[PDB]
Amino acid sequence: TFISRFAPDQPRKGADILVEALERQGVETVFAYPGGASMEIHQALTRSSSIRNVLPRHEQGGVFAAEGYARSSGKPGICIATSGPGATNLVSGLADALLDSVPLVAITGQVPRRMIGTDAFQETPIVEVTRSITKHNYLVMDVEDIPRIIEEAFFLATSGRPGPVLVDVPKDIQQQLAIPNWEQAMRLPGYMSRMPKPPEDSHLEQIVRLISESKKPVLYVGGGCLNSSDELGRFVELTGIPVASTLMGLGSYPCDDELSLHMLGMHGTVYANYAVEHSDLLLAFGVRFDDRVTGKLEAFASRAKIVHIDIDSAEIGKNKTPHVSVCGDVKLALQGMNKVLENRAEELKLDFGVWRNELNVQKQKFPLSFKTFGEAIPPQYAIKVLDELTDGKAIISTGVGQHQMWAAQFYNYKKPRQWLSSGGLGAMGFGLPAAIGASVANPDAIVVDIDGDGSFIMNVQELATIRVENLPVKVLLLNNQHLGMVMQWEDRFYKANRAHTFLGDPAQEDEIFPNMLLFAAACGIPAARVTKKADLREAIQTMLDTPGPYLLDVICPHQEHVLPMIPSGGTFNDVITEGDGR
Amino acid sequence: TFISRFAPDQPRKGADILVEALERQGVETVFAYPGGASMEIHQALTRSSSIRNVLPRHEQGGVFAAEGYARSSGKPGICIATSGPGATNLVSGLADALLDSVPLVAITGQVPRRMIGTDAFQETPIVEVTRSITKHNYLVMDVEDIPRIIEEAFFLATSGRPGPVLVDVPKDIQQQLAIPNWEQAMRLPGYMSRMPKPPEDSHLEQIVRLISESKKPVLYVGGGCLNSSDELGRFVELTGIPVASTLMGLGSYPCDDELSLHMLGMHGTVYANYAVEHSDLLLAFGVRFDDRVTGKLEAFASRAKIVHIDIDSAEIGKNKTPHVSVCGDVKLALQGMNKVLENRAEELKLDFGVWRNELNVQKQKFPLSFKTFGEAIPPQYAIKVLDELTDGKAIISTGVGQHQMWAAQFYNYKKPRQWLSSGGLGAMGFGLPAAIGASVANPDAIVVDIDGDGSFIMNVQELATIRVENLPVKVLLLNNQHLGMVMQWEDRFYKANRAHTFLGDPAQEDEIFPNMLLFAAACGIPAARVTKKADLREAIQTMLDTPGPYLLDVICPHQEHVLPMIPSGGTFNDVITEGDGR
Amino acid sequence: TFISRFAPDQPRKGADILVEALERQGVETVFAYPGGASMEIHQALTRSSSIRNVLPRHEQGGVFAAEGYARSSGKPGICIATSGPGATNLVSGLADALLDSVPLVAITGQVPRRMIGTDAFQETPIVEVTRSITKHNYLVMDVEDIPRIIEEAFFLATSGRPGPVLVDVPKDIQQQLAIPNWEQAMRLPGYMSRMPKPPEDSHLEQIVRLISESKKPVLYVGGGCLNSSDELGRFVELTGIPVASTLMGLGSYPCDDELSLHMLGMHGTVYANYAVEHSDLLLAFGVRFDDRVTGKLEAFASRAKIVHIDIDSAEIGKNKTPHVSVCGDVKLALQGMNKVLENRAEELKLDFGVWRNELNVQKQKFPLSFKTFGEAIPPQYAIKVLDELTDGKAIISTGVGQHQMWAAQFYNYKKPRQWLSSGGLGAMGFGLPAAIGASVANPDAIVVDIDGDGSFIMNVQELATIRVENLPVKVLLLNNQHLGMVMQWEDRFYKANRAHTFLGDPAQEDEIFPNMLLFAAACGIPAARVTKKADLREAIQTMLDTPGPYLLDVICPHQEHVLPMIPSGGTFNDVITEGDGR
Ligand SMILES: Cc1cc2nc3c(=O)[nH]c(=O)nc-3n(C[C@H](O)[C@H](O)[C@H](O)COP(=O)(O)OP(=O)(O)OC[C@H]3O[C@@H](n4cnc5c(N)ncnc54)[C@H](O)[C@@H]3O)c2cc1C
Ligand SMILES: Cc1cc2nc3c(=O)[nH]c(=O)nc-3n(C[C@H](O)[C@H](O)[C@H](O)COP(=O)(O)OP(=O)(O)OC[C@H]3O[C@@H](n4cnc5c(N)ncnc54)[C@H](O)[C@@H]3O)c2cc1C
Ligand SMILES: Cc1cc2nc3c(=O)[nH]c(=O)nc-3n(C[C@H](O)[C@H](O)[C@H](O)COP(=O)(O)OP(=O)(O)OC[C@H]3O[C@@H](n4cnc5c(N)ncnc54)[C@H](O)[C@@H]3O)c2cc1C
Ligand SMILES: CCOC(=O)c1ccccc1S(=O)(=O)NC(=O)Nc1nc(Cl)cc(OC)n1
Numbered sequence A, B, C: 001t002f003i004s005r006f007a008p009d010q011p012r013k014g015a016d017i018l019v020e021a022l023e024r025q026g027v028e029t030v031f032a033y034p035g036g037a038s039m040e041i042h043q044a045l046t047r048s049s050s051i052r053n054v055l056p057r058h059e060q061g062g063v064f065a066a067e068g069y070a071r072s073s074g075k076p077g078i079c080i081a082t083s084g085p086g087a088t089n090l091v092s093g094l095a096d097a098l099l100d101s102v103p104l105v106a107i108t109g110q111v112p113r114r115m116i117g118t119d120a121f122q123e124t125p126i127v128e129v130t131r132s133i134t135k136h137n138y139l140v141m142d143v144e145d146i147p148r149i150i151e152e153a154f155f156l157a158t159s160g161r162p163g164p165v166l167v168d169v170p171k172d173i174q175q176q177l178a179i180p181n182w183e184q185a186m187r188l189p190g191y192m193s194r195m196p197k198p199p200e201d202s203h204l205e206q207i208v209r210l211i212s213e214s215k216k217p218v219l220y221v222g223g224g225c226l227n228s229s230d231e232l233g234r235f236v237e238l239t240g241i242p243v244a245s246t247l248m249g250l251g252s253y254p255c256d257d258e259l260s261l262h263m264l265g266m267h268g269t270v271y272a273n274y275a276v277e278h279s280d281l282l283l284a285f286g287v288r289f290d291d292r293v294t295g296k297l298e299a300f301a302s303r304a305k306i307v308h309i310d311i312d313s314a315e316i317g318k319n320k321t322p323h324v325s326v327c328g329d330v331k332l333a334l335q336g337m338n339k340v341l342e343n344r345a346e347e348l349k350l351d352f353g354v355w356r357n358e359l360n361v362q363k364q365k366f367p368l369s370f371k372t373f374g375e376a377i378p379p380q381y382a383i384k385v386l387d388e389l390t391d392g393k394a395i396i397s398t399g400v401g402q403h404q405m406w407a408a409q410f411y412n413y414k415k416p417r418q419w420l421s422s423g424g425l426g427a428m429g430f431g432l433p434a435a436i437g438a439s440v441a442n443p444d445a446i447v448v449d450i451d452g453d454g455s456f457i458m459n460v461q462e463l464a465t466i467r468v469e470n471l472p473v474k475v476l477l478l479n480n481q482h483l484g485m486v487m488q489w490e491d492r493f494y495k496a497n498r499a500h501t502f503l504g505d506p507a508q509e510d511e512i513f514p515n516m517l518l519f520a521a522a523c524g525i526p527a528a529r530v531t532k533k534a535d536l537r538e539a540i541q542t543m544l545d546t547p548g549p550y551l552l553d554v555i556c557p558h559q560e561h562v563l564p565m566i567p568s569g570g571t572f573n574d575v576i577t578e579g580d581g582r
């Protein structure tokens, strides 16, 4: 089926064997920045007609773009870098992908084998450095291993709990001629042996039993449900259980649906954390009970039976001890529980209307809210407008901080993989590059990077990439001249004592600095600034209608605070519902 | 002598103990970007009146600035970052500092101790990740250890062979109240035990003997001589031996002096590599025989007695086996050899005029040269002009690539620490941030970042830093729209087959892209472009005269090639002396 | 040339491929104790007709026997063990072989691959455990790798600086059928690249020059000269330089020769340490300047030019900085220096008679001495008698402690590999097993284990091995009822306060306990006890004449002290020349 560009008996460079190894894996896009140790790989890349390369302006842009690509498509993201500084520049991306469980294959050039360990030119013990921040990694020591290693890398990166896999390739192996063997078996006996088997009916039916025996059930959905959109939907319309979601799970279940309790956790809705606090049955599907959503563990879902379904046994019971657990693919568990629920439909007759009502009053008394001052633009409102004008069908990437929380709170995602945000590591500068990858993976979609002025400037060089690759990336920059989140904490716990959180110029405290519009201009990207809430709707519409890339700089009053808020290690009873920096 | 801000019996936060620990070390400048896990440290920083913080726009800008600071002053550079993404963003800087042996202390915030290893919010096993790319590192586990650890970190970072030391501080330890003990002893028994002792006369006199017995002696000076400017000078005026230098040693001995053979190595002068090739005595002081300068080891200084003086025993004999070696401070070895040379002056009567003549003819027949096409600006010439207008007294930082080699070749450094360039790791994006640190460390100096368009855009966000800190950083951008060095190799070994090396826009192949002038404008930094060689001198003069920061975009024809050139693993007989991409 | 037992196209078990891999390496003897995880290997072993297995009674006996085998033959020693407890029981042997640089290949069975890391039955992460105590190690993950790994293991174990290499083989790979490829190349690019090249005449002639310019030269020979017996001899008869030896070098140069200064170091002769203390030229060939022989480094050979020739660059300059060094095979360096010395014979005319005389008076005034009390047997005398009756042609293995020092001091070894003793690690219980290996490697030699009662009982179970394998192992047990060496230190530095150093029975303080004769009897080995010095000569003669194994229990007064003695970190001026525990 796969047509090679070489004769089955024709020897060729390891670099060419590596590129074909990617083509055979179905790879169509890579993000690679050339360097001396990876030149061969780049040369082989130009001979490929099926793989396109998006040249970033910084290796970190490369990884983050690859992540965006992966996060928005469900396919693995592929980035390639040269040795030494090239490789070390990938680090934050690798750690980011590992914490959020993003399938990713990173390939780095390395000095020739004989040179390894000699403090060679541009050498870095990248395999040693990344071991604790990758799912697995490799140092290829023989051109004969390329086919197997690449196959194993993708298998490991995409199977079980997804994660990044780095493959280090010495320059001498890239140049070595050889005849590849695409028939070799993978050496993952231990891993393949531990791969979860399909869920058992005994386990699944025990859950359905618990559901029928509960009066206050709550679904706690996370990133693990990103491929169970339909199954989860069907499950909810069969149990009528309210859905609470993590920052990573947004979109698994439509935030606009009436059964949606939206996001729970530190900056989750009062009613979502309420539901969990008083539930008697917690259906934790595809979540890792992070400190961000649980607060004080002992207090989290204290009065309820916890059912935990995770593909990673290491997660089941790590922070919370379930009353029931299923180690396996939540997608299969749902399909299984669904058949059962459809059959015992009449026999069960599930009705949680009373519970839902208790929550609806909570949703009515404590809804997400924002204040509008004069004609100043409220970031929450800006996002709300973007949602409306895009009919909530846009792919949203973001930086980290207040804008991130607002992008999560005030936009209703219809489907998963519409939300691209760094959650576990929370790396700034992720938004723009992620949007680049998302756009390449989704050419006909509306891709909007809702960034912060601090996060946006970190990888601002990628604007050049966007222009050159002619990608329709829209940038909704919520400019507040500060490091919003750190500032909020300064206000709440440090008597507003500012400590290097102002991003503007102290000499002209009133001038917007820097002028992000000129950054766009430098890369030939049309831009505009908006300061009055009245002109907001038209500015955003313009951004959307103007073909190609576009940067809308939205000025906002910095004293805004993200609410509600449960301080770290807190309880639902410590939730802060009001206040700002005014 | 040191005045604390706390009573000797008054308990205070570990964060405050850490900041005072820095003040007691004489620290006056740090480069810190605030984050949740390091907020306490930042708060304590604002209470200090002796330490100023330069807030970068990216953690990588922070480290590189700290390096620039260190490299231009001889003091350790200090950068601080928050946990997780903050910390991982330091990686390239740490590896860079380790490879070039730059004293540096990096402090990173970390999640609370009890949270370590739990996959906590913004947690990264930074100590595990950086172990192979730092001189040493620490994870503080008790507020009581702060004083000792900080003292050890600086001692280790600055003593022996300088290098980076990272100190990870849990958030709970930053908030813990305690009374510091500044009297605690350091626990470096093994390290302090292995510290080289002052050179022995027996060893030193054996060297002077070799010098008197040689007919073709050559000095091979490197980064280890950065603090031996005077001693080396005196040594040369007592032996009249020609000085060849590494990229790291530039300036140890004035490149303008007649005894100077300039840089040796891959892109070294023909006469420098000549001198070494035919020498009978190689005085390797403060060098590590890198593959970049030796080429094929067996062929390097094949016909001569090698004397190697290094402060790191691990280096002596690593790639080349000396006939004589001295493990110790080259500064002391020189002072020692100098006294001997002054005494046995008449008894010795050293005369290498015949050898120097053989080299002068070589210097005359094969000098550094560049070609001028029409009115196009030759980068070499631009640098040559900068040298003249600044009287060669400027601090020059650079990116990595062709411009770096030209900045090395066509500028005559009078003193060491005038040249700030990433040599071992060769990390792009180093130039602008390094200039920032150099300027802060040298407020009254002319600081010029000779950057490449590829390297410059990587950390372009630091332009914001430059403006806000009101630093007189001048940027001489040699814009060639390409990744010059990779392109040169494509021309020489890949039939000019371009593989993602063009940095401009393919849709407007003739328009300079991006418009670096607008990047400067965005950060309120005056800029100008120059395209005609005739207008070059006035443009540079303007850049220098215009008070404050300034960006001069210098357009150059990309087909330029760095020469001469000895291909990797080559011999002096493989040196390429002509050709380009036209 | 090599005749397989399988058809070149016939598939067979990995176990059989491993055994053939050994046969192809020339292996004729292995020391293997069967276990569940290694059963396949043992089964394949019985099908071999060229490899004999010596079944020890304890895995530690296995390794030590393999060491003895290696140490007495110059061939690598091979031991095989099962997984878990089998493997961990090898540890002391591996560390011992690494510290003394003994070529050794250890093969351990391991649980099936899929079971690794699951806390399986008899599983131990042996590769992780032994990484810091082996030259290198492997975990075979594919039956296809066996041929290459075994070849690499032996190459690494025997090349450069010899050392142990452990190969872990999963049980499933032992049973997997396959067709071996004995043509595969080794993947040791880096290692083979760093292998020392033959010495250069420039370096060698510089040494001969130093020799001619010296008045007080001293040879400091170590374990690295074990294969340079002839070359060293020739070198000495051409320079007439006195030879001092380490505990590891004994026999490289005959201790009986008049030019021999015998052993230097802590328990070295007064004249040997004298020679070094006052020498002006130290020829350190095949030594690692251990703390045992140097004492206080600063004081060691303080007034002299040090020439160091080592095959391990990591050793040159580790503790002492030479004035000259040669990284390479001392055997070749000597052959080179010899040709030079033979030619410039007349031109040089070397005469160190005056120096030798200064030393001969020292050898006359401070010779090795022992005191004889009544009819009590002096251990020194016993060894002296053994030497005479065996004409100093016996292979002597020993335990660790006082008897070891006496075996070193009072026996004159004619050739290297006659002395088998644990020097760097100093592991007790080494003597008996080492003798077993030495005897198998030298069937027609006189093999005597000069053991201590403490060391002897540790691996006393090997007596069973000796009987069953019908090996002519003679055991000269110097029984003193104590842990001699620890006792000596108690006397000198702890006012003779005994702390668990008495090995006899406190209830019958005067009865020799245990009765080692009955241990021999239990294993059908003829034995006898001797208490009167007058009956000593006849007892030893009997031991030697009685065909087969024999144990002579020699009772000695425990208050004996090893002299002379330079306390740790001491100087030649701190040497203790008299005293005991009476
Ligand atoms: C400024 C900031 C504020 C934050 N505030 C909040 C907040 O208030 N609320 C909040 O929720 N988060 C918040 N976070 C995000 C937070 O750090 C965590 O990233 C997030 O809570 C993790 O959610 P998760 O466990 O659902 O998803 P993941 O971390 O993606 O974990 C998914 C889990 O699902 C398992 N799984 C994967 N695939 C499958 C499958 N097919 N079948 C079954 N199981 C599977 C995994 O192995 C894993 O255990 C914040 C982050 C930042 C940067
Ligand atoms: C694009 C590119 C091209 C390059 N081309 C060249 C080229 O053509 N020529 C070239 O020279 N380099 C070149 N390099 C730089 C090169 O990679 C190495 O960084 C450089 O050769 C190292 O020189 P060094 O050994 O002298 O200095 P360092 O790497 O700084 O090493 C200094 C050494 O001195 C020792 N030492 C330190 N302090 C003391 C003291 N007080 N007393 C005694 N010893 C001390 C150290 O421990 C160490 O061994 C290039 C780099 C790049 C990025
Ligand atoms: C109770 C006790 C007391 C001791 N007392 C003493 C004492 O008083 N005096 C004493 O000497 N020792 C003593 N030791 C032994 C001591 O611990 C060291 O094992 C010994 O000094 C090491 O000597 P070495 O360096 O010569 O040999 P090794 O440790 O075998 O080192 C040999 C060296 O030679 C190099 N080399 C190897 N092969 C070659 C080759 N072909 N060409 C060139 N170089 C090569 C190696 O790589 C290495 O650096 C004692 C030990 C014990 C247990
Ligand atoms: C930068 C990558 O370097 C290496 O892989 C490398 C490292 C040490 C020794 C030899 C090589 S090499 O000879 O296999 N390759 C190179 O040296 N390549 C190389 N490419 C570019 Cl573009 C520039 C350069 O040196 C300045 N060198």
Ligand SMILES: CCOC(=O)c1ccccc1S(=O)(=O)NC(=O)Nc1nc(Cl)cc(OC)n1
Residues within 6 Å of the ligand: A266, A291, A485, A486, A489, A568, A569, B035, B036, B037, B083, B110, B111, B112, B115, B120, B121, B122, B171, B172
């Ligand atoms: C980001 C640093 O985080 C931590 O140190 C951390 C990690 C896991 C659990 C508790 C904490 S903590 O309670 O000691 N501190 C915080 O959680 N700090 C914090 N600071 C900001 Cl500015 C934002 C935030 O959460 C969104 N959290």
Ligand SMILES: CCOC(=O)c1ccccc1S(=O)(=O)NC(=O)Nc1nc(Cl)cc(OC)n1
Residues within 6 Å of the ligand: C035, C036, C037, C083, C110, C111, C112, C115, C120, C121, C122, C171, C172
């Ligand atoms: C002791 C070695 O054990 C193993 O290799 C082992 C470990 C875990 C699971 C399966 C095996 S196994 O099935 O490949 N082999 C055995 O279990 N062998 C085995 N051999 C013996 Cl003589 C006894 C025994 O179990 C009591 N088991």
Ligand SMILES: [Mg+2]
Residues within 6 Å of the ligand: A452, A453, A454, A478, A479, A480, A481, A482, A483, A484
């Ligand atoms: Mg902001």
Ligand SMILES: [Mg+2]
Residues within 6 Å of the ligand: B452, B453, B454, B478, B479, B480, B481, B482, B483, B484
């Ligand atoms: Mg360029």
Ligand SMILES: [Mg+2]
Residues within 6 Å of the ligand: C452, C453, C454, C478, C479, C480, C481, C482, C483, C484
């Ligand atoms: Mg004893």
